[PDB]
Amino acid sequence: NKIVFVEDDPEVGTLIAAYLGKHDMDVVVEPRGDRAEEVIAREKPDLVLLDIMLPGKDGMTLCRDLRGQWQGPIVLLTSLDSDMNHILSLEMGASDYILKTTPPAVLLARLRLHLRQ
Amino acid sequence: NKIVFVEDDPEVGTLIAAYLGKHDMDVVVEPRGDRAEEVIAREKPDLVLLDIMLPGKDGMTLCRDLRGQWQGPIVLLTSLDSDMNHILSLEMGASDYILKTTPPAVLLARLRLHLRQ
Ligand code: BEF
Ligand code: BEF
Ligand SMILES: [Mg+2]
Ligand SMILES: [Mg+2]
C-alpha cells in the first residue's frame, strides 16, 4: 500500500519511511508543503500522512484543501502537543491526529486501522 | 444520540455521563462486564465506550465478542497505558483506544468523529 508522507526534517522522514517499509508500505516522502497536492495527485496514494510545521505551506491548511479534492484517510503527525490543534484537525476532516512521540508500532497499527475504509 | 458506557469506577462514570450529557448525548453507565451485552442488546446504542479493567468480564474480551454481533463503533477508554493493548484492540475490531488521561474536550472530539465515520 502507498503512503505519501509530507515531512521537512529529512531524518525522521527517512526513519519513518524505513520502518513503514519493513512492514510492507510504499512511502513517498515529500519535504515541501508547496509540492504536495501535486505529488499527491501524481502518486495517487491510498493514505496521506501530514506533518504540521512544514516549509512554504503548512500541514493543517494542506489538510483543509486536500479534503475537497480527495476523499480518503488523511492523518496528521506532529511534534505539536496542542489539544486545540487536535480538536480542530478532526473538525476539518483529518482522520487522526498523532503525536510524534507515539511508538512506531502504534503508528503502524493506526495507519492499518485507517487503510480499512 | 445514545452511548452505553461500561465502567466500574463510579466517579469517572458520573463525570463522563454529566459531561457528554451537557453535550446532548444520552449516556447509560453499566458497571459490570458480564452485564453489558445485555444492557447493550436492550439499549441499542449508537456507540459503545468500554473500560478495560472491569468486574465480571474484561473490556478487551468484551470488545472482540461485540465484533461478531454488533457493528457500531467501539471505543476503549482506559487508565492502562500499554502499547500492546492499544495495538491489539485496534486489531480485534475497536475503533479507537483512549487513555483516561485525555482531556474531555478531546474525548468528545473523537466520539463525535466516530458518530459520523
Ligand atoms: F514538524 Be512537525 F510538525 F514536528
Ligand atoms: F478500569 Be479501567 F480500565 F481504567
Ligand atoms: Mg516539521
Ligand atoms: Mg476500572
Residue numbers in the entry:
A (entry chain B), B (entry chain A): 2 to 118
Q: What's in the article?
A:
The RstB/RstA system is a ubiquitous TCS composed of the membrane-associated histidine kinase RstB and its cognate response regulator RstA. K. pneumoniae RstA (kpRstA) contains an N-terminal receiver domain (RD, residues 1–119) and a C-terminal DNA-binding domain (DBD, residues 131–236), with an overall sequence identity of 79% compared to RstA from E. coli and S. enterica serovar Typhimurium. As a member of the OmpR/PhoB subfamily, phosphorylation of the conserved Asp in the RD is believed to result in dimerization of the domain through a conserved α4–β5–α5 region, accompanied by the binding of the DBD to cognate sequences in the promoter region of RstA-regulated genes. Genomic systematic evolution of ligands by exponential enrichment (SELEX) experiments in E. coli have shown that RstA binds to the consensus sequence TACATNTNGTTACA with tandem TACA recognition sites.
